[PDB]
């Protein structure tokens, strides 16, 4: 359950992200594959070193895939569909790399937002982006 | 577990500055409120009804305290981190019975404090390293259920 | 995602189960809290010894549940919401432990429906107490 | 880990009755049909398209029999895992990159499939020593990440 403080929430952290999201998504895919190196097996065509124009490309492609669930909270399945498709079917990515990922995506925001990043915005946060996972999952077993 | 000397380096150098009167009880509270199943655990310490509730509870900011001892005692014990946490182990797992993938949680939360505090200064590099010591504490914490 | 195929390999497999749901529910129960003692903490005022007239109640609960999420496999979240609040808000349930009873529940069918347990009906049925385990934890973090 | 001499005799007395040129073929075949992700680490076996493509190919049910005889080794050293378990610890995380979740999917997997040739004799506590020893399987072969 996103309540609705939850998406008041998530809609602020994300509108002061504002036009850094492409390069915080970008940031959160390196400190995923710096702290957990098991994700880098499912990018062997990227360079993933700093400065990658790869992982830089991919960060903006994550962080608008994001910010489609912003605006589409109250119908995620349907906004992801798509990319659930891709990642499971396609990609077989296992899904524990989505908690991963979602943990370096809160440590970029607590990176970046210092008067945003409150409890209540990090549980708000963190609560979106295990939404996004399973959603991103749920064509392996939901 | 083994860090590097670059990531000993990283992890010593930004623990220094940390504030262990405060650190330690910003982690628990923010585990109490973003997990909050684990406020099964702390009954006792009264009002965790909200998020504000839970910050500022002084059990909290206390036991939150002794958590971030035990931690920096594993900063000074890297290389052997399963001696320094035995008594830790027998208690959270054979007295508690706290599940271990909240060791995880709560050592992902401490990693989200470090990065909300040091910001830009808290690097992917930096992370890595720390990403390193938690596991191995959460590990030395679950030893007795292995 | 339970696919149409799912849904009649988990009708299938439960209808074969008969009358024996509640002694099952029971069963599965007891090997949890044998195979995974972790969990026994959450019924301190149960006596969890075999043949626990109180493990045998309790399984029949967890069957019924389990039936009526079959029946109305297409509207989960509102067929369990209650059971959710409860598990969530009152009990406090680690989200973890719904993982061991579902392996629980598994093993259980397993051990008594050899011809049912095939290996499309085994994985319909993963899905199936998957689904069952995310809604009953939604509300956390869903 | 420790089994108990009636955990050990739970086990050992199963254990000489499975078939060892099947169940793991079984395990190995339900873990890539129930958890499709695992298939990532197997293209090379050809047809995985559907349960019945995946259980009769003849590659899943060869290296099935390794992965069971991995177990059967496991068995012979229950109170030291660690040392029987370091090469295939290296093989699977430093040079396959396994999240060792999925050693532990497929240790239950290989439970269910006790569970389903065993019947009334696969009883909650013989069970309950078996979910020690795959815990202690999956452990070890994760040592190379701890
Ligand atoms: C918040 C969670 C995630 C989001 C929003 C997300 C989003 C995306 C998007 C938008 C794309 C590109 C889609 C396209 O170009 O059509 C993509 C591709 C991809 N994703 Fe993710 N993803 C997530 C989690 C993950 C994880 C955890 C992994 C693996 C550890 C992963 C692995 C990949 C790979 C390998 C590709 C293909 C890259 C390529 O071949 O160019 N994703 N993802
Ligand atoms: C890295 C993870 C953890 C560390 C380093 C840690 C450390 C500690 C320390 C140092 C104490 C004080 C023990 C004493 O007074 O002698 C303690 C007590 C306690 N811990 Fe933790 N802990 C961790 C994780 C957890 C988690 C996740 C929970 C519950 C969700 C938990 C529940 C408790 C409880 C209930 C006590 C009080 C025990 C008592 O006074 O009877 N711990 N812990
Ligand atoms: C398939 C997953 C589950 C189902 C279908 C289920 C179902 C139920 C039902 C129907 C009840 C009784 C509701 C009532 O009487 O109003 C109940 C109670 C309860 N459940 Fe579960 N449950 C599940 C998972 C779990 C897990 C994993 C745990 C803990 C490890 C748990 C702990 C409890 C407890 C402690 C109670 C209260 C018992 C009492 O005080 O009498 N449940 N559950
Ligand atoms: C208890 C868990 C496991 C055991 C005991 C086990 C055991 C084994 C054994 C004995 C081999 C043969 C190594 C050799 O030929 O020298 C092997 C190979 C392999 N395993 Fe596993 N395994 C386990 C879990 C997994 C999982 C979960 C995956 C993937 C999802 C996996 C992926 C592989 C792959 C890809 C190989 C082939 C390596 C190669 O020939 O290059 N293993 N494993």
Redesign the interface.
């Given at each position: 359950?996103?309540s609705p403080a939850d998406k008041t929430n998530v809609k602020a952290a994300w509108g002061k992200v504002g036009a850094h999201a492409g390069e915080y998504g970008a940031?959160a895919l390196?400190?995923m594959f710096?702290?957990?190196?098991?994700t880098?097996?499912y990018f062997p065509h990227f360079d993933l070193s700093h400065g990658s124009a790869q992982v830089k490309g991919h960060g903006k492609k994550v962080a608008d895939a994001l910010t489609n669930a912003v605006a589409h909270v109250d119908d995620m399945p349907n906004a992801l569909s798509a990319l659930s498709d891709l990642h499971?079917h396609k990609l077989?990515?296992?899904?524990?790399?989505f908690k991963l990922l979602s943990?370096?995506l809160?440590?970029?925001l607590?990176?970046?937002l210092?008067a945003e990043?409150?409890?209540?915005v990090?549980?708000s946060l963190?609560?979106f982006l295990?939404?996004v996972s399973?959603v991103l999952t749920?064509?392996?077993?939901? | 577990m083994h860090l590097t000397p670059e990531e000993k380096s990283a992890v010593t150098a930004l623990w220094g500055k940390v504030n262990v009167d405060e650190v330690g009880g910003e982690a628990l509270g923010r585990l109490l409120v973003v997990y909050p199943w684990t406020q099964r655990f702390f009954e006792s310490f009264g009002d965790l009804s909200t998020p504000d509730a839970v910050m500022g509870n002084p059990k909290v900011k206390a036991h939150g305290k002794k958590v971030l001892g035990a931690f920096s005692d594993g900063l000074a014990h890297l290389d052997n981190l399963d001696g320094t946490f035995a008594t830790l182990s027998e208690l959270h797992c054979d007295k508690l019975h706290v599940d271990p993938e909240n060791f995880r949680l709560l050592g992902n939360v401490l990693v989200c404090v470090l990065a909300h505090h040091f910001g830009k200064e808290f690097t992917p590099p930096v992370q890595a390293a720390y990403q390193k010591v938690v596991a191995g504490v959460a590990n030395a914490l679950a030893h007795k259920y292995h």
């Open positions: 359950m996103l940031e390196e400190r710096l702290s957990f190196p098991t880098k097996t499971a077989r990515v296992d899904p524990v790399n943990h370096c809160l440590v970029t607590a990176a970046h210092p990043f409150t409890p209540a990090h549980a963190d609560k295990a939404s399973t749920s064509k392996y077993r939901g | -």
